[PDB]
């Protein structure tokens, strides 16, 4: 309702008033693309991004949650988020002290990567690939779950982007994730590998060298029917 005042309250020194504005803003950000558009028209994005460079970890956590929800908008809305300078503060956050902040920053990056190839290129230029690949082994299964999703979306980009992903060393941790304890992680890793398997013969050669083929074949004896099917589809996409 009173969006410009809430956007103004995003600059309030009073943290109670700020968090009150952040909660209202976040509820709008998760209300779909028409609601996200209202946040954009109210000039919410720049003040929102500015909060990623804040003293309070909780304010950062709340602002990234809202950014992740805005990043789930259409390609034009994702573009407005990039223009507001969201990429650099998000990439810096992949090395943050808080695991919950990392999870949300990876979630935001995964949503940005679900946009067009120009927006995937913007993530690559902001240097998202190296810290994302680094996160493919970082303790938390929930963090890995976010990181694989981001990488799978990046892997659906053009051949130059897939090559950039391979250069950042994505293949060895992805192949190891085909034998991860979590079934959801396996499915995600298969999706990422199937996207890499889609494209030119140079990328297919790289997957074969990484050991994706026996790892995909081992999944043909997995208890889950959907995992077997996706692994077979990934091997078909390779042949």
């Amino acid at each position: 309702s009173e969006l410009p005042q809430m956007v103004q309250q995003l600059n309030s020194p009073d943290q109670q008033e700020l968090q009150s504005a952040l909660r209202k803003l976040s509820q709008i950000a998760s209300g779909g693309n028409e609601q996200i558009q209202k946040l954009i028209e109210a000039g919410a994005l720049s003040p929102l991004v500015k909060l990623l460079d804040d003293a309070s970890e909780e304010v950062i956590k709340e602002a990234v949650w809202a950014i992740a929800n805005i990043a789930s908008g259409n390609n034009e809305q994702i573009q407005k988020l990039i223009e507001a300078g969201a990429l650099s503060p998000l990439v810096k956050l992949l090395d943050d002290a808080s695991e919950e902040v990392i999870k949300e920053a990876v979630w935001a990056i995964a949503n940005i990567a679900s946009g067009n190839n120009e927006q995937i290129q913007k993530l690559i230029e902001a240097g998202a690939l190296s810290p994302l690949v680094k996160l493919l082994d970082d303790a938390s299964e929930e963090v890995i779950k976010e990181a694989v999703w981001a990488i799978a979306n990046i892997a659906s980009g053009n051949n130059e982007q897939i090559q950039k992903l391979i250069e950042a060393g994505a293949l060895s941790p992805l192949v190891k994730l085909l034998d991860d304890a979590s079934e959801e992680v396996i499915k995600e890793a298969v999706w990422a590998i199937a996207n890499i398997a889609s494209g030119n013969n140079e990328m297919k050669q790289k997957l074969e060298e990484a050991g994706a083929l026996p790892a995909l074949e081992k999944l043909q004896s997995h208890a889950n029917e959907e995992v077997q099917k996706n692994a077979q589809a990934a091997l078909e996409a390779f042949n």
Partner: peptide, 8 residues
């Protein structure tokens, strides 16, 4: 090829 939003 497959792109997907991460939703909750």
């Amino acid at each position: 090829k497959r792109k997907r939003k991460r939703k909750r």
